[PDB]
Curated annotation (Swiss-Prot), chains A, B, C, D, E:
Native species: Homo sapiens (Human)
Span within the parent record: 103 to 151 of 698
Name of this protein: Cytoplasmic polyadenylation element-binding protein 3
Record note on quaternary structure: Following synaptic activity, forms amyloid-like oligomers. Aggregation requires an intact actin cytoskeleton. Interacts with STAT5B; this inhibits STAT5B-mediated transcriptional activation. Interacts with E3 ubiquitin-protein ligase NEURL1; this leads to monoubiquitination and activation of CPEB3. Interacts with CAPN2; this leads to cleavage of CPEB3. Interacts (via C-terminal RNA-binding region) with TOB1; TOB1 also binds CNOT7/CAF1 and recruits it to CPEB3 to form a ternary complex. Interacts with SUMO-conjugating enzyme UBC9.
Function of the molecule: Sequence-specific RNA-binding protein which acts as a translational repressor in the basal unstimulated state but, following neuronal stimulation, acts as a translational activator. In contrast to CPEB1, does not bind to the cytoplasmic polyadenylation element (CPE), a uridine-rich sequence element within the mRNA 3'-UTR, but binds to a U-rich loop within a stem-loop structure. Required for the consolidation and maintenance of hippocampal-based long term memory. In the basal state, binds to the mRNA 3'-UTR of the glutamate receptors GRIA2/GLUR2 mRNA and negatively regulates their translation.
Biased composition (Polar residues): 1-12
Length: 49, 49, 49, 49, 49
């Protein structure tokens, strides 16, 4: 087994605020927990032309 | 097993504010916990032209 | 096992404010905890042209 | 096992304000805790052209 | 096990204000704690052209 991946690219802004990244061989046997609950937030997101 | 990865690239701004990165062989057997709960926040995000 | 990674590159600004990086063989058997909760914040993020 | 990594590169500014870096073989068996909670902050982030 | 790393490079400014670096074999068995909470701060960050 020999997977081939591609490069990751970006030209404009990239606002990766609050997240988690992994890469490469990552065997898991224990426990991994991901829970998310903000409870007073008023976001705004923009469109495009 | 011999995975091949690509380079990571960016030309514009990259505002990686609050996050966690991993790379390479990272076996896990214990516990990993990720929990997120901001509770008074008013974000704004921009669009494109 | 012999993974091959690529270089990490950046030309513009890179505002890595508040985060954690790992690289290389990092076996884990204990506990790792990541929790995030700012509670009075008014961010702004910019778009592109 | 013999992973091969690439160089880390930057041409423009790099404002790594408040963070933690690791590199190389870093086995962990105890506990590692990461918690973040600023509670009166008004950031601004810039876009690109 | 014989990982091979690359050089770390920078041409422009590098304002590494408030952070912690590690390199090389760093086994950990006790406890490591990282907590961050500034509570009256008004940062500004710049974009690119």
């Amino acid at each position: 087994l020999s997977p081939s991946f591609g490069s990751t690219w970006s030209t404009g802004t990239t606002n990766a605020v609050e997240d988690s990244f992994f890469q490469g061989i990552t065997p898991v046997n224990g426990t991994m927990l991901f829970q998310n609950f903000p409870h007073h937030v008023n976001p705004v997101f923009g469109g495009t032309f």
